[PDB]
Design a protein around this ligand. Structure first.
Ligand SMILES: CCCCCCCCCCCCCCCCCC(=O)OC[C@H](COP(=O)([O-])OCC(O)COP(=O)([O-])OC[C@@H](COC(=O)CCCCCCCCCCCCCCCCC)OC(=O)CCCCCCCCCCCCCCCCC)OC(=O)CCCCCCCCCCCCCCCCC
Ligand SMILES: CCCCCCCCCCCCCCCCCC(=O)OC[C@H](COP(=O)(O)OCCN)OC(=O)CCCCCCCCCCCCCCCCC
Ligand SMILES: CCCCCCCCCCCCCCCCCC(=O)OC[C@H](COP(=O)(O)OCCN)OC(=O)CCCCCCCCCCCCCCCCC
Ligand SMILES: CCCCCCCCCCCCCCCCCC(=O)OC[C@H](COP(=O)(O)OCCN)OC(=O)CCCCCCCCCCCCCCCCC
Ligand SMILES: C[C@H](CCC(=O)O)[C@H]1CC[C@H]2[C@@H]3[C@H](O)C[C@@H]4C[C@H](O)CC[C@]4(C)[C@H]3C[C@H](O)[C@]12C
Ligand SMILES: *C(=O)CCCCCCCCCCCCC
Lengths: 127, 221, 171, 128, 110, 81, 62, 122, 88, 71
């Protein structure tokens, strides 16, 4: 109860066009024809400085990538944040409210110099 | 204090950099997934510095840097509570997200919109950190709904799949029913305690709390 | 409609999928696949045309009671985990007619080969209409399916969208 | 015998377990065939315009137009005030409004007594 | 819970990708040695989910049953938690058995 | 590339659990035609696999060896100074 | 089959079976694959309620 | 909870109610009862910011342990002895409150016999 | 996806490599053109088992409305070819 | 993506492995057992018990300050 002769031909005829079409869906070696692209000298130095494998120098290359990221994305923002916090946020009352440090027995205060007497003798035992 | 507060906010500000640069300030599509991952990597290191200080001397502070809106006797600020719950969860969340994004670079390597997938993943992380560090109820609500809306977009990632849309809208429906309780809590605290700040809610310490806490339980449900 | 022959084939086809879902382990599936296979041959030689229907209805009813609540589905079928997963990446072919010339110049070879197909379809359109009208009953068509290409050069009528449909894995 | 399947509006009867597919009368074969006839005439008309290359627009669908016209603009001219519409309209339209009136009126009347007498706590209430 | 629940999903995703977007465990198996590293993490995390002693989860999960057991609690709620903890092992063993042990059920070309 | 399929004349149902099916169906007078089609899931690397208890004890021989030396190593500098 | 003439505005619009769109041959080549309709086919009065993102009426095992 | 079977499937009068623990008379009954003393009187507890539930009677131990953690950082493995001391001190408190449970339970059993005698005298 | 592309000839090797382990057909008689009813007269119900083997081999599953129209080892490659967009 | 060892997908057979997979996989499996055993040895109280539970049945009415039944 398979295909009637017409159906077998039509499917064959369709597949003949179908696979021709799918072959047209391939890019020639020259594609895409990207417009001319400017390459910065800083990029040129790395492409020429890396070239071959030279795994030893990649650590220098990676350190450059991390140093750049650790500078623009960490050091610069913490300057902006710190300047904002130190001279603008903290000049107004109760903008940053800390929790007063815990004071344990037998400690001296840096500011006032007070000493808190230790606790009473412990009637403790071994174990 | 300066180092603790400065390093607490830098973690949050760092995560927004990939979003800001996504406005065509540095066009490197092929490297954006690695750019986002490395940002999460440093956010973990930065968060550990205030995390360690809490472990050592139990330091803890609030940061109300910005004044947004004063409705008569209710003052709304962009406050941040860096305490036990936030200090421990921030490193954990960033550490786990770090591994997920690195895993997702390989897993989603064949997706045409991988760049748009990492921006959404980073948007959720920003909403969650707002939710975790919120000091007043309104700011918490911003993150509360923010995570809810990114879930809608990420669940329905393959949007030609009707079952993905159905699952996406289903999440909004159930979480919307929960948001009824959250607004119930906000109305109670303002009406009775005259505030949305957690510092003032605890200081007054109301006795009768069935209604406001019943609402929160529905929000958590 | 489905011929009584077709129904038995479908009933047998599904019964093994649900049966395969109960066994999981291959060897335990083979043992019972033969047994269920045998139960068909028991009444297969029957040629009553009135008791075979009764068994089929009892067969269908028996299948429903034991059918797996959660049958396995291949992940590209109506119900699988990746059904229509790539429907968003599939785009029509007419969208390229609206491209800007600058971005059309990025593929000088590809679009030259496209213009040929538009010429090929444009030339072939008139013959395809003529073929369908003559090979169709006076009162109108009676079923689906179209005639194949009779003469050389002529292409199967109504072929453009079937031939030029989007790929199943566009990207 | 296994329990028979019981259908419902939210769970239709399976086609296999339906005593209407197996019977092959003279009417069924010439009826299930007729449905495929018109169904094919429409597809032929659609196929001609769909595959036409000298066409750029929307294929008007009269079935779609009739669907929307019967849902918005044809409802009123086919409406008769009788015992069903009047009763259905009354308890769906006036019902809820009355129900919510006595709920809120009773609640606010109860509150006002507790505030005039001072029995409602409003210690920190300075926002409204 | 963040550490190992996230690990479990990633390890599950590793199996998914290899088997050509197949999620049903009734079409998996025989991967204990085929993907040794995914298997190691899967067993490591699955044990953590079940609450192996001296492993992330023990310091939180076990310390809760101790407090739940010895508290002025609801007996039915206390019972339900304990039954649930046993159920944690059953479906974990379901994943390991159908996804790592036995003989493979996946297609031929993978 | 031109991937080469293994020669098909190596799928023997004997020596694997699939044969036990053949004996069972032979009793009632039937055979499993696709038996050798499923024979690739038991021969080769797939042949045999660790047990559930064996899988859990993965990497247990070395850990015990490391543990005994660990306690012993600590003991050396434990009651000496 | 017209809807009952109870004076609720239905008029002479066909009363198609109350079947969801998920209950249709998923493999038949639909003119609207997502909706599972055919051009020129009379749409159900509640078509917008029976789309695949909504009420489903497929037979259930239990 | 073995005792639960007694209180819910046995006699309720003998078992003591956890929310109604002994309202019995004062120290009378145990000759020369000794008051339980405290170390961190008022300001030492309200200077280490101890939680409202932790600083019951082992505050001196808990305060001492917290002192070691601050100094031992980052040697979080240190202070183990300090934590053990507080655990033991808490344990003794746990048993001491546990004794009151059995102390009243038998007092309840003793108290019923006298009532039974009077009812059964006639 | 990293899954190797399926070649037109590569499919045919798999299709016959499955029919050759059926244990109901003669390996030397089954060829690219071997009808299951007119050439070697295989049972119709065996078509269901034949197709199921194909579906379990390639992953995807053929519809029953079109599985019943395929008894030609050459046609199966044609059908799979027109379902995974294979052209070479 | 990544290094791409590019192990050919073999037909019906066991998939190819590499030297890095097994060594690293086995390394963590032994680490888990080493960590499990090392911690169990030093402090087993956390998993079996810290302090013995004092049975109140094996006590005396004197230490509890129970007045005599004879008043
Ligand atoms: C002045 C701005 C000038 C616009 C310049 C745009 C540009 O050059 O980049 C083009 C940029 C890159 O082009 P593309 O790669 O082709 O992507 C566009 C596609 O359509 C794909 O776009 P998409 O799908 O990615 O969606 C874009 C949009 C929406 O994407 C989403 O994220 C979905 C919404 C989820 C947000 C939930 C997070 C919670 C937010 C509250 C937390 C605070 O993203 C945003 O709105 C920014 C991220 C949120 C910050 O595209 C766009 O950004 C979309 C057009 C610009 C829309 C701007 C809308 C936001 C502007 C806000 C300015 C006022 C501040 C408001 C503060 C209060 C916040 C409530
Ligand atoms: C309930 C709360 C919920 C809130 C929801 C709000 C949603 C909106 C989205 C969040 C936006 C948060 C980001 C806002 C950044 C702060 C902007 C700012 O600095 O504003 C000026 C602020 C002084 O404002 P203030 O005195 O507090 O009172 C003003 C009342 N409108 O501070 C200053 O005085 C300016 C000081 C600037 C110092 C830095 C200068 C260098 C910057 C270089 C950048 C490169
Ligand atoms: C605990 C929760 C358990 C769920 C209990 C709710 C069940 C509701 C229900 O069974 O009603 C379904 C109702 C039955 O009517 P049905 O037979 O389907 O339609 C006529 C065809 N004979 O069919 C309907 O949907 C009509 C509306 C019912 C309203 C309830
Ligand atoms: C409240 C009033 C409830 C009245 C219910 C009883 C009405 C009734 O039985 O007859 C109404 C009449 C039909 O006559 P009847 O004797 O019922 O037999 C059919 C003959 N045509 O039908 C009529 O033609 C008379 C008009 C019926 C009453 C119309 C007004 C009330 C019903 C419509 C509700 C309007 C809803 C407005 C919503 C606003 C809020 C959103
Ligand atoms: C450091 C990271 C990965 C390389 C590495 O492991 O070091 C590399 C990959 C792509 C880089 C980023 C992208 O190139 C986009 C930006 C390009 C400019 O160099 C400014 C920083 C910039 C944001 C880069 C920061 C950093 O160097 C990145 C993130
Ligand atoms: C008292 O509070 C016991 C609470 C623990 C509830 C779980 C009891 C389970 C009993 C099972 C039988 C075990 C007997 C050793």
């Amino acid at each position: 109860s398979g295909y009637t002769p017409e159906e077998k031909l039509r499917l064959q005829q369709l597949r003949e066009l179908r696979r021709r079409w799918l072959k047209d869906q391939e890019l020639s070696p020259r594609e895409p024809v990207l417009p001319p692209q400017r390459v910065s000298p800083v990029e040129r130095f790395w492409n020429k400085f890396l070239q071959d494998g030279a795994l030893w120098k990649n650590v220098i290359y990676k350190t450059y990538r991390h140093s750049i990221f650790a500078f623009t994305h960490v050091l610069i923002p913490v300057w902006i944040i710190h300047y904002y916090l130190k001279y603008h946020v903290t000049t107004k009352p109760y903008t940053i409210v800390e929790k007063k440090p815990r004071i344990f027995p037998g400690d001296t205060i840096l500011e006032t110099g007070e000493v808190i007497p230790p606790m009473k003798e412990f009637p403790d035992q071994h174990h | 204090m300066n180092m603790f507060s400065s390093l607490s906010l830098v973690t949050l500000l760092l995560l927004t950099m990939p979003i800001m640069m996504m406005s065509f300030n540095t066009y490197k599509p092929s490297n954006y997934p690695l750019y986002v991952k490395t940002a999460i990597s440093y956010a973990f290191i930065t968060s550990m510095i205030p995390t360690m200080m809490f472990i050592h001397s139990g330091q803890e502070l609030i940061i109300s840097n910005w004044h947004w809106l004063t409705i008569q006797t209710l003052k709304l600020s962009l406050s941040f509570k860096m305490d036990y719950f936030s200090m421990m969860f921030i490193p954990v969340a960033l550490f786990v997200t770090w591994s997920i994004m690195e895993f997702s670079m390989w897993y989603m390597y064949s997706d045409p919109n991988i760049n748009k997938f990492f921006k959404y993943l980073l948007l959720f992380l920003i909403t969650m950190l707002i939710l975790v560090t919120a000091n007043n109820l309104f700011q918490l609500f911003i993150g509360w709904e923010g995570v809810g809306i990114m879930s809608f977009l990420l669940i329905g990632w393959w949007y030609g799949r009707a079952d993905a849309n159905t699952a996406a809208l289903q999440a909004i429906l159930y979480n919307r029913i929960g948001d009824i309780g959250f607004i119930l809590a906000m109305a109670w605290f303002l009406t009775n305690l005259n505030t949305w700040d957690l510092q003032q809610i605890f200081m007054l310490n109301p006795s009768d709390s069935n209604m406001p806490l019943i609402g929160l339980a529905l929000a958590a449900t | 409609y489905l011929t009584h022959q077709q129904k038995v084939l479908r009933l047998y086809k599904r019964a093994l999928r649900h049966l395969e879902s109960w066994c999981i382990h291959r060897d335990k599936y083979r043992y019972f696949a033969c047994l269920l296979r045998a139960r068909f041959d028991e009444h297969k030689n029957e040629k009553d045309m009135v008791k075979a229907t009764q068994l089929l209805r009892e067969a269908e009813e028996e299948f429903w009671h034991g059918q797996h609540p959660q049958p396995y589905i291949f992940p590209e079928s109506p119900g699988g985990t990746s059904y229509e997963r790539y429907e968003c990446y599939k785009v029509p072919e007419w969208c390229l007619d609206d491209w800007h010339p600058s971005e059309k110049a990025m593929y000088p070879d590809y679009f030259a080969k496209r213009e040929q197909w538009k010429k090929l379809r444009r030339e072939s359109w008139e013959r395809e209409v003529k073929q369908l009208q003559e090979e169709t009953p006076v009162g109108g068509p009676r079923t689906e399916a179209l005639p194949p290409a009779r003469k050389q050069g002529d292409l199967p009528p109504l072929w453009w969208h079937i031939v030029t449909r989007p790929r199943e894995r566009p990207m | 015998s296994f329990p028979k399947y019981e259908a419902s509006r939210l769970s239709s009867l399976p086609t296999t377990l339906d005593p209407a597919e197996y019977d092959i009368s003279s009417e069924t074969r010439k009826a299930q065939a007729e449905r495929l006839a018109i169904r094919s005439r429409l597809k032929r008309e659609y196929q001609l315009q769909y595959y036409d290359p000298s066409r750029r627009g929307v294929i008007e669908d009269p079935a779609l137009v009739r669907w929307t016209y019967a849902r918005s603009a044809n409802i009123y001219p086919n409406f008769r005030p009788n015992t069903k519409t009047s009763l259905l309209g009354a308890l769906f339209g006036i019902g809820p409004l009355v129900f919510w009136y006595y709920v809120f009126k009773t609640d606010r009347d109860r509150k006002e007594k507790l505030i005039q007498e001072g029995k409602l706590d409003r210690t920190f209430n300075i926002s409204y | 819970h963040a550490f190992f629940k996230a690990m479990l999903f990633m390890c599950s995703g590793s199996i998914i990708h290899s088997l050509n977007d197949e999620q049903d465990i009734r079409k998996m198996g025989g991967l204990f040695k085929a993907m040794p590293f995914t298997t190691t993490a899967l067993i490591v995390g699955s044990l953590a989910l079940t609450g192996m002693p001296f492993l992330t989860g023990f310091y939180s999960k076990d310390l809760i049953i101790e407090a739940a057991n010895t508290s002025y609690t609801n007996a039915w709620a206390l019972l339900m938690t304990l039954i649930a903890t046993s159920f944690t092992a059953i479906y974990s063993t379901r994943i390991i058995f159908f996804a790592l042990l036995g003989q493979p059920r996946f297609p031929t070309l993978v | 590339s031109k991937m080469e399929l293994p020669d098909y004349k190596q799928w023997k149902i004997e020596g694997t659990p699939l044969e036990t099916v053949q004996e069972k169906l032979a009793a009632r007078g039937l055979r499993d035609p696709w038996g050798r089609n499923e024979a690739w899931r038991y021969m080769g690397g797939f042949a045999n696999n660790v047990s559930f208890v064996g899988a859990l004890l993965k990497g247990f021989k070395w850990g015990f060896a490391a543990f005994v030396v660990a306690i012993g190593a600590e003991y050396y500098l434990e009651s000496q100074k | 089959e017209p809807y009952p003439d109870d004076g609720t505005g239905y008029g002479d619009y066909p009363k198609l079976p109350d079947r969801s769109q998920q209950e249709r041959d998923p493999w038949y080549d639909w003119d609207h694959p997502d909706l599972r309709l055919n051009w020129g086919e009379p749409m159900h009065w509640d078509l917008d309620m029976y789309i695949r993102n909504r009420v489903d009426t497929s037979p259930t095992p239990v | 909870g073995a005792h639960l079977a007694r209180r819910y499937l046995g006699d309720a009068s003998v078992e003591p109610d956890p929310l109604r623990m002994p309202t019995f008379p004062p120290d009378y009954g145990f000759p020369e009862r000794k008051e339980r003393e405290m170390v961190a009187t008022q300001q030492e507890m309200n200077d280490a910011q101890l939680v409202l539930q932790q600083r019951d009677y082992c505050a001196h131990y808990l305060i001492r342990f917290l002192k070691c953690k601050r100094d031992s950082f980052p040697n979080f493995l240190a202070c183990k002895h300090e934590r053990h001391d507080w655990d033991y001190c808490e344990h003794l408190d746990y048993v001491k409150r546990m004794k009151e449970f059995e102390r009243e339970r038998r007092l309840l059993q003793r108290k019923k016999r006298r009532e039974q005698r009077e009812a059964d005298m006639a | 996806s990293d899954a190797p592309p399926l070649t037109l000839e590569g499919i045919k090797d798999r299709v016959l490599y499955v029919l050759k382990l059926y244990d109901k057909i003669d390996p030397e008689k089954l060829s690219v053109n071997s009808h299951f009813m007119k050439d070697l007269g295989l049972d119709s119900l065996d078509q269901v088992e034949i197709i199921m083997a194909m579906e379990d081999e390639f992953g995807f599953e053929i519809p029953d409305i079109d599985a019943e129209k395929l008894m030609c080892p050459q046609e199966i490659v044609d059908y799979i070819a027109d379902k995974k967009d294979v052209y070479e | 993506a990544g290094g791409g060892a590019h192990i050919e997908p073999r037909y019906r057979q066991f998939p190819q492995l590499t030297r890095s997979q097994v060594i690293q996989a086995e390394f963590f499996s032994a680490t888990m057992w080493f960590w499990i055993l090392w911690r169990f040895w030093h402090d087993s109280d956390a998993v079996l018990g810290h302090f013995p539970y004092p049975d109140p049945s094996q006590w005396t009415d004197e230490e509890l300050g129970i007045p005599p039944d004879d008043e």
